[PDB]
Amino acid sequence: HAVSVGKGSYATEFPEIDFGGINDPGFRDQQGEPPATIYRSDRVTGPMQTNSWWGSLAVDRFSMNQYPHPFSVRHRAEGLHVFYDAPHNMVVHENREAGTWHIHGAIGTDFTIKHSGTANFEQAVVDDYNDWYVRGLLENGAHQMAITYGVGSPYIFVEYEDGSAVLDFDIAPDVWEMNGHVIGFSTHDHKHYAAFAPPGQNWSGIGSKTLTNNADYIAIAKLPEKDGNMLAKFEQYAYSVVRDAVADWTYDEATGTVTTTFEVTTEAKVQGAPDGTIFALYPHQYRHLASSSENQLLQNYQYEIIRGTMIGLEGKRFTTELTYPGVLPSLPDLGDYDRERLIGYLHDATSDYPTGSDTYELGKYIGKLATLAPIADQMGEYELAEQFRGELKDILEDWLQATNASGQLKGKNLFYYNENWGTILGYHAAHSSATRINDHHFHYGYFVKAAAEIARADQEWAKSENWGGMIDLLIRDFMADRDDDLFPYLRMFDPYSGNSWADGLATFDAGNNQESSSEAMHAWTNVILWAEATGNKALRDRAIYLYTTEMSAINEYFFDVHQEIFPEEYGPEIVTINWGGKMDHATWWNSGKVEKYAINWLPFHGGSLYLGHHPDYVDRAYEELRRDIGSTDWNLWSNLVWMYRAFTNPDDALQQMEASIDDYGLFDPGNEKIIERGSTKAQTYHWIHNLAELGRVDPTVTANHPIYAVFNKNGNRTYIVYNFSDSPITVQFSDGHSIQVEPHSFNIGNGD
Template sequence: MAVTTPTVAPSPSYACPSCKGTGSNLKPSPVSSASSSPFPSKGYSQQSPPINKRNYNNSNSKRSDGDLFSTPISPDLSIPQSIPSQPNHPAPRKGIKQSQEGGGTAIPTNKFHANFFLGSQSSSVWTHPYSLQWAKGQGSSGAWGLAVSHTDASQRVFGEQDPNGSGAARWFGSPVGRADVVLSEQGLEKGNATGGVELMTQDVKEQSIRVQLVAGGDVKLEAPVVQGMGMVTALYKQGTPVIKSGIGWKMVTKAMGVVKAGVVKYRLVMEDGATWLLYATGGDVSAIKRGEPGGLELEVQGNNVAVAKGSFTGMVQVAKLPGGVNGTEGLADAEKLYDAACGTYATGVELSGSVDGQTGRYTFNFQKEGLSTNSSLVMFALPHHQASFSSDTASKVVPSVKLDTTTKGVAVAVVGDQWTMEEDVSKPMSMGFVPWTPEAGSIKTISDSAKEYIKTVAQKELLGTSQGQDILNQTDQPSMYFGGKALAKFAAILVAVNDVLGETDMAKKGLDQLKVAFARYSENQQQYPLVYDQSWSGIVSSASYTTGDAGVDFGNTYYNDHHFHYGYFIYTGAVLAHLDPSWASSASNLAYVNSLVRDVANPSSSLDPHFPSFRTFDWYHGHSWAHGLFESSDGKDQESSSEDSMHVYALLMWAQATNNQALYQRSALQLSILSRSLNSYYLYSSSNPSSNIQPKEFVGNKVAGILFENKIDHVTFFGNKQEYIQGIHMLPLMPHTLFVRNREFVKEEWEAFFAGGAADKAEGGWKGVLYGNYATVDPRGAWEVFTGGAAAEVSTGGSQLVESPGSGSGNGTIGTGTGTGTVESMTSTASTASTTTTPGSTTPTSTSVPTTPGAMSSKMVKRTIRRALEKGKGKMGMPLARAALPKAKKDGFGPENIDGGASLTWYLTWCAALGGL
C-alpha cells in the first residue's frame, strides 16, 4: 500500500486568534473599546463565586507534611470583592462532565489536552512521544475512534532557510493526522451515520485526562491519557473493538506463546516500515487475576481494518517499537519492556516536592490501574528530565528504548511508577530586586559618577515635569499586558533609585504615585476591569465581554498569556511590598496580588478550588504554555521564554517580600527547572544542552521563535524582523536574566545577528532591548551606547556587594533581611531605616528615611484615580518611555529607543552594576 504522508505547511506569519496587529510594536496593539464609559456592572454578579472557604490551618487540607504543593497561596480563599463574578464564558466547555460552575473542580485551560474540549474537538493532543486525535471520520482511515500517531525525526518537515541570513531552516514540524493506529469500536463506526458520536471528558487534571467516545448515549471506548505514557490504552465494556490505520499495514500477526495470563499480543508491521505492538487483555480483570482465559481475536479486513470476532470487555494497548524507519536499535529491549508492562496503565500523576537546603526536588507519582499492581509502568522522559533525575530514578532508565518527540528531542523509557528530579536552587534563592549575576550575586554598589548620571536620568523618567503624574497617565492602559509593563517599568526605576542610588526622597515621591497607579488596578477601576469567570475558574479581563473580540488584549479573557500579564503586576506588588512593608499588610493589597498569583500559580486546585493548579506552567515540559482557550492544530504554544521566566521571578520576589515560605521555595524550584528547560528547547548555543537536542538544521536560529507542541517556527506573532524574534526572548531584563540566558549564549547570538552595527538598525524600543541584553557580556560597551559615550569611573574598592535576601545561610528559607531598602509608608508618621552600602565595603549602613510629606489618604487615592481616568479614558496615552531625558552625547540613545516597558534608568543601573562602573 502506498503511503501518503501529509506535510506541514505553516503560513509565513501566524494569524493567531489571540493576537491582533503587526508591525514594530513589541506586542501587537490591543483593540480598545470605542466607548469611554466605565466598565458597566450590568450582567455581572457582585458576589463571590459559590465556593466555600476551606480551613487553611486544618491538617486535612495538606496532602503530606513538607510537601511544597500542600499549602495554598493564602489562607484567604475568597475572590477580592472588587472583582465581580461572571457565570458564562464565551468559550463553551465541550463535553466536559465535571461541574460547570463554582463548586466543581477547576478545569485547566492551558494544558496539553485542551483540544479534546475546544472547537471541533478533533485537533491533536501530544502526550510525548505519541499524539492522540479524535479521528471523527476524517483522513484516509475514515475512522471515528481515537487515532494514535508517532513521527520519527527522519519524517520531520523543514522550511526554507531563514531570510534573515542565519542559514538555518525557518521552521520545522511533524505531519499531523497520520493516524498510525486507530482504536475504535463498532458502535462508533455505525453511530456516525446518525450523527450520534460524541467525545466526552472527565477527570481533567494538569497532566492527565480521561476521554470517552460515546454513541447513542453509551460509552463505547474510554481512554486514560497521561503525559509521557509508554502505551496508549483503550478500555471496552461489552463492545466490539475495531482497529484501523491511516498509514496501512503490510501484515498483522498474532504472537505465539503466552505473554501474560489473559493477554493476547499482535504485531502490526506498517507500510512506512514501523512496527507497532497491540496487547489485548480480555475478560473481567478479577477473572484474569484468577488465571481464567480471556483474549481478543481480530479478523483482518484488508490493509487498514481489523475487527474483533466477538464482544469484548477489557483493554487494548498499543505501543510503537523503536527502530522501524530509523533502524533496529532498541527494538528487542522495547518489546521485552512492553511485554512486562502490558495489562497495566497510567491514569494520572500526583505531584509532590521539597526543598532541602540548596536542593529542590519534585516527584511524579504515577497512578495506575489494570491487571496487576506488581507490573511497573513504562513512561517516557524528556531530555531535561533525564539530566536532572535522582540517582534512584536514573537507575530505572532504559537508554536503548527511545522514541523521538516532535519538539523536545529524544524521549527515553523509564520503568517505574515514580520519578524524582533534582535541581540546585541556591542561585534563585540568592536573588533580590537589584541587578544580579551568578558569580557576584546581587549588586548594589556603583561609582559616584555613575550614580550622578543615572540620577539625572531618573529625575526625568520618574518625576517628569509634573512630579510624577506621568506615572498615572502611562499606566492607564486598556490592556492588562501594557498596563502591567508600565507599572513594572516604574517599579524597577524605584528599585534603582532607592536600593542602588540611595536617593530615598526621590524614591518616595515616585512610590507615592506608583501606589496610586497600582490602586487603579487593585480597586478594579482600569479601562477593562477584571472579572472572575466561573465557567473555567479564573480571573480574566472583561475586554472580550465588552467588545465581543476574542483577541483583545492578546486573548486575556480566553486565558492567553496570563503569566505574562499578571507577572508584571506581581513584580510591581513585590517592589511596593519591598519598599513599604506596610503596603502589603493592607488586606486589600495582599488579597489582590495573591489573587493574581493564585490564577497563574495555584499549587493545588483541591485546596484552593477557585483556580486550576498551575494554569500555565507545565511540570512535565518544564516551561509554560501561553495558549489558552483556542483550538490549535499544532497544540499549545509559547512565544516569549523570557516573560515566562520573568513571571516565576516575580513570584519569587513576591514570596520574599511577603515572607511566603512555601511560595518562595516553590518558585525557586520552578525557576531552576525553567532555566534547564529553556536551555534545552528554546535557547540554542554550543554550550547549551539544546545543541544536542534540537535539529542541527534549526539551531542556527539561536532561539525558538514560537515553540508549539508539534513544531517550532522562528518568527513572532507580530512580525519576522530579527530584533523581534530574538528580542521577545530577552525582555524584560531583570535580575534573573543571567540565570536563564548565560553569557556564552548571549555572545553567540550577538555575533550571529547583531554584531558589526546590525543592532543599531533595530527599530524603536528594540534597540534598547538588544543593548540591554548585550550588557550581560559587555556592560561597559552597552553603557557607552546608552549614554552616547559618557564616562563612568570604575567603582572603588571592588565593592560589588553580594546580598542573599532569600537565604542568609543557604538553608532554603527566607532570610530576615527582606525589608532591606525599605521606603517609608505613605501613611505612617514614623521613619524607617533603609539599607545602603558604603563604597568599598560589604557592610550595610542604616540610613533614616523621612516621612513623605502630604501622604495620601484612601479617599485621596480614589479621587486621584477618578481624575486620571476621566482625563485619559480610552487612550493608549503617550509612549511609555517618552519622558524628557538628558540629551545624549554624540549620537547616543534617545527615548525612542527604549521599550515602553523599560527605562533608561534601569538599563544604566544594569550596566553600571554588571560592569562595576
C-alpha cells in the first residue's frame, strides 16, 4: 500500500527489495529498517525524535556514554554513572602513517547516582524530552529513578519513586563543605561537584565511599571551582527542575539578523524556587550573546570541555544574534573564462553517470546535473541545460513514485514511511540511511537541489499538486516544523549545540557525530532556494535559521577560526568529525590527506560562500594541508582544493588548475585524483574564474532580501542578486547601495 501526494507517492508497507542480483551481505543488510524496539515510556507518543545527543538512551536497553556538557553520563542497571573530563583525562594523539589525530577524554566514573532500593534496573527509557534536555527513567517495578539532564546544563536533576538517594564512589571523596542537606565535594583526583537535597534531609556517609540521603529529590552540580560562594549560587537554582526548553527564533529580513531565545520552564521542588536555571553556554552562543542577556552572565563560571570553554548564565532565558549572509542558486556569469572551453566541458559532462543505485550516489549525480544546468544557460546552451533538467525530472519523477505502471510497489527507487519511528527511508539505501536513520540531510539535500533547479525554470512542476508535495515531504523528514503528524521537530538539528547530528541512533561511547558539515549546509541552502522558488516563506525562514546557526557552530568546532578551541599541540587546521565527547582528524572510510579537509568543503554550490568569510583561516588551513602534502600534488580531489584556494588566492588556484585539469579526459569513476566524482571540470573552471574577477566574499554587507552575495576586490564591491519572483524587485544593501532586478534573473551576469 501507498499514499498519494500530488503526482507522487510513498510506501506504507516495507517493499520487497529488488537487490538486482547483488549478493554482498553488506549491501543487502543496508536495505532494512531501523530498530523495532524503542526504549520510551508511554508518555512519549508520536514520531520519535532521532539524531540526538541523547539517542543511545532510546536504542540500547540502558544507554551508551553521553555528553550533556559539562558532564558525561551513562545509564546502567546499577544507576547513572557521572564523569567529568579534567585536563589530566584529556589527550591529543597522532597516528602519522594513517594521517589521523584524535582529541579525546576518558570513559570513567567519578561517581554513580543510585537508588537505595535497587542496583538492578531492567532498563532506562526516554520519558520526555524537549529541544535539548531529556528525562531518562530507570525502571524496576515500583522502583524508579527519573534523571533530567542536557547539554548546557551543569545540573543533573534526580527524582525517586519508592526509595531515596545514594552517591557511590570507588574512592572516598573529600567533602569540603557540609551544610546538612547541601554538600560540596571533590573526587580523589580533585574534580569539584555539589549535591543538593531539600532542607532537613541531611547527607550521611561523610568520609566514606557512599553518601546517602533520605530525600526523594536531589540535584547534582558540576562546580567551576572549589568555592563556597559558587555553591551558594548553585543552591538557588538546584530545586528548579527543567520541564520545558525551547529555542524560538526570528529572521528579520531587512537586517539579516537571526535572533534565537533559549527559554526553560521549571518546576519548584521546594517552596519559593525561582522559575529558571543556570545555563552553560557554548562558544557559538556567548560570542553572539544579545546585549540584553549580558547582565545574566556569571563571569568567573567556566567549564573546560572538548568544545573549549563554557560559561555560566543565570535566569529563565537568554538570546543570541547571528547574521544570515545570503545564498545564491549558483554563481553568475562573471568570470574571464574562455567560453568555448567552458561549453566543451559542459558537453563532456554528458558522459557522467551515477556510480550506484543508492540515495547518496544518486544524490551526488543529480547535484552534479543541477550545478551544470544554470552554467549551460549562461553559456547560451539552453538545449543542453534543458537536457540536464530533463534528466533531473526523469530521475525525480521515478524516485518520488512508490508504485510502478501496474500499481504494485516497486523494489527500488522509492521512498517508504517507517511508522515505528516516523521517518522517510529511501531504497536503495547506503551508509545506514535506513538501518540507523543516518545522514538524511546529506542524501535528501541533493534531491532538494535537483528540485530547486527544476523550480527555478519551471514553477508548474514544483507545485504541491504536481511533484512539489513529495519534495515538501522529504524536507519535512529532515527539518519538520513543530506538531508535524509524521515527523519529529527538526530531526537533524541540535538547537543548543548548534549543529546537526548525523547518526540517527547515537549508539557510540563518544555520543553522536557529524562529519560533513558542508553537506548539512548544502541541505539548508537548497531548502532556502526551493522555498524561495515555490513561495514558501515559513519554510524558507526555518532553513535560514538553520543555515546561519550551523555556520556559527562550524566556524568554532570544525574550523576554530578564532584559534581558541583546538589544543596548541593539535597539528591540523581542521577537525573532520565532531563528536559529543571527542574530535577526530579522520574520515569514516580509509582516506588520504586532502579528504580529511575537503569532506567539510564539498560539494561546492551557491551556498558555499560561508567558507570564505574568514580569509586568514582559509590561508592557514590551505597552508597546513600544502605543508603536509609537501607540494600542490594533491593526493585526491585536486579540484576541490583549487576551488577552496580561490577564496583567498585565485591566481594560485588558476595556475594549479591550468597545469592539471586536462590530465582528466572524460568521466572515470575509478580516478578522483583531479576531479572528485560529485564534481565536474565545468564547475571547477566556472568557479575559479568567477572568483578571480569578483575577489573576496564580503560578509560585512547584508541585504533586505535573502538570495544575494557581495564580493570585494581591493575595495570595489560587486553585488549579486537572484530574483525568483514574477515581478521586478529592488534590493537595499546595508552600505547604501541599491539595485533593481528583473524577474527570474540575476542583476548582472545572466549570460545568454
